[PDB]
Ligand binder design. Structure first.
Ligand code: HEM
Ligand code: HEM
Lengths: 363, 362
């Protein structure tokens, strides 16, 4: 039920405990007026401060002039904050606008092409994103819908993704959730309490070269289809060999308990965990924060499902990219396909009631 | 925690409404009646496991290394979560297995209605399974595993996820709001109302289809909302569309949500006025639908709405007259019916030896 604080050095929704639901929206900018865009960021911030406290935006959902559309669309009336977080990010394409070219962060690297991808361009990229996470899906949709409405005429929704259930953990003291392949996903991640690891691996620092991004992070989103029919035909041992962990307990091969440290050399050479581990990737460590999805059927008799992968890191070049490169030979590749992608620079936090999303970028 | 699976009636009709839905329509590929009965028995056994929070078959792990696990594993560590699994039989089922004359007359095909825009690929179906639970992953796991168990005998035609309230934080007695921001459910048949269920929801033997006694008939409509145009309407326009105020949800002229409506005070094509039993020869529904939000369409607009479900004793005396009377509804400007199906939902699984469809198949 409770609220997650909206203000801080960092935006919430990163280190925060992972909530049950996701509504992620990517927007494109339509206005060429920088002052109008700044005004939108401030109005959006004000809205987010209301939303994340369980309050209606603007002057509320009713009680205004009868002839006026309500300021808030009303479907969150009577609900709780439900741990809603709203996290904004700026895509590389934003920096072509508003005289921002020289402020594009070097750590906001475009991804290379990866073997096997079939990326839907229409559901990739975006000038900006808002990640809405909450325990109540109606709270999350209300937030996105009202931000979109506020932004009408200045931004448009390019694409969106709903996540029905989490597949990630920033809280190793709680149960690790399972993805739709049936495996625990999030055992060896980064905890919200691991201050030093967050500083090392997640938060941008001023000396990294982009002052406005200090206390921000960089986000990679990958929409990944799962080949459920093929997976579900695989043997237990094939599935366990793919990952390098057993399925029921989720321990590394040869170990009895989920959180026992892996002995990588006992895994298959191609195993996902072996290839993805920091030790395989120059120490590169990610904060994974994704969710599962299911998008109807394939039209031909089969349920369609997948995982909407999210990773936060201090630098895309030393986080996602080396890891995904090392997954070129991953045994998992037989059962997945990346079908959408985007990257964003997620600014530092909203410091207090007078601050606003993007203030360090825009001034 | 759990809702009992066995009973005179299938659970998921009159039982308390859960927070989440995974609804699947299936088409039958087998022509062999004995093989189909064998599937119904296997599905029943699976449903007994699933609704008690247990893995299907021999489980999700621990079996022979070389064998695919019987259960795909994504519900391990979760709870029963009030899961119910409710099966229904579409009109098209009855053209198989020599069942033709056992198609109930109360399982009427819907007429075409003004403004319909039905996607035929997301309509119909030989069978349905309505999975409802508080944890969406529990519902998805159930549908995924039933589909897996049935593969070779059935395929999935279409699939819809939905949500209502989140009961951890929202009082059970509080009426849900739909995505237009209005309370939705105020005047409905509740599963507590045993006498009203016998009048309006359960099929009786005397109604003409003995195998259906204690079953019900289900209408599903996938109803998209034009969210952005709705949100541009004034508060008074919105309230006029329904005949209730938005904040409290009281009828025009009344102070409280649950005060009985005075229909004459509503506009003549207000939704409540057109939908009320008094306007429809006494026709009364058990509405049991769920909101949906599926994404953004190819114009940037929200793909969202109501996955409307109604249970009734006879489609001809329930949904059809009411929907016909919505032809001039002021709501029509803001909605579009884009998927549809009907199903005969049999009586319950009476005990541990019984199986879904036993009254139909014998
Ligand atoms: C549908 C796709 C994916 C599935 C099903 C999946 C599944 C898993 C599972 C079951 C684990 C073991 C438990 C744990 O989190 O420690 C794991 C670990 C991991 N995954 Fe994935 N994963 C997927 C995609 C990716 C991608 C795209 C990346 C990065 C490019 C990635 C990076 C990692 C990392 C870094 C670990 C932890 C390794 C360690 O330090 O022990 N995963 N994944
Ligand atoms: C997206 C579409 C729809 C929306 C947003 C909607 C919304 C509402 C709302 C807000 C109410 C008032 C509160 C309540 O008593 O539940 C209501 C009542 C009702 N609706 Fe709808 N409805 C929709 C579609 C339908 C359809 C398709 C039918 C049947 C064909 C239907 C039948 C009813 C009935 C019977 C009532 C109760 C009237 C009474 O007895 O007072 N609705 N609906």
């Amino acid at each position: 039920g409770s609220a997650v604080p909206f203000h801080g050095a960092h935006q919430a929704g990163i280190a925060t405990p992972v909530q049950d639901r996701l509504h992620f929206a990517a927007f494109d900018v339509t206005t060429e007026d920088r002052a109008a865009f700044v005004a939108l960021l401030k109005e959006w911030t004000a809205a987010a401060r209301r939303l994340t406290a369980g309050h209606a935006v603007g002057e509320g959902a009713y009680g205004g002039l009868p002839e006026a559309p309500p300021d808030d669309t009303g479907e969150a009336l009577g609900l709780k904050p439900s741990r809603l977080t709203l996290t904004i990010g700026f895509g590389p394409s934003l920096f072509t606008r508003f005289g921002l070219a020289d402020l594009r962060p070097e750590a906001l690297a475009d991804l290379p092409k990866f073997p096997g991808d079939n990326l839907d361009r229409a559901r990739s990229g975006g000038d900006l994103c808002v990640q809405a996470c909450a325990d109540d899906p109606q709270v999350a949709v209300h937030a996105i819908r009202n931000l979109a409405r506020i932004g009408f005429g200045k931004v448009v929704v390019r694409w969106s993704q709903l996540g029905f259930g989490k597949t990630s953990s920033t809280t190793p003291d709680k149960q690790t959730p399972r993805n739709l392949l049936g495996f625990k996903d999030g055992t060896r991640n980064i905890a919200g309490t691991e201050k030093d690891r967050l500083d090392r691996f997640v938060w941008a620092a001023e000396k990294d070269g982009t002052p406005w991004m200090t206390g921000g992070s960089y986000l990679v989103a990958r929409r990944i289809r799962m080949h459920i029919e093929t997976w579900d035909r695989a043997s237990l041992q094939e599935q366990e060999d793919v990952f390098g962990r057993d399925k029921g307990e989720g321990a590394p091969v040869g170990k009895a308990k989920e959180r026992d440290e892996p002995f990588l050399k006992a895994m298959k050479p191609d195993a996902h965990v072996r290839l993805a581990h920091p030790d395989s990737n120059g120490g590169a460590t990610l904060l994974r924060r994704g969710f599962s999805f299911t998008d109807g059927t394939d039209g031909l008799g089969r349920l369609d499902a997948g995982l909407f992968f999210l990773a936060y890191q201090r630098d895309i070049r030393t986080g996602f990219v080396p890891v995904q490169r090392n997954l070129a030979t991953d045994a998992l590749n037989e059962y997945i396909q990346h079908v959408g992608s985007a990257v964003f620079a997620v600014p530092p936090g909203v410091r207090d009631a007078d601050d606003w999303w993007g203030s360090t970028l825009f001034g």
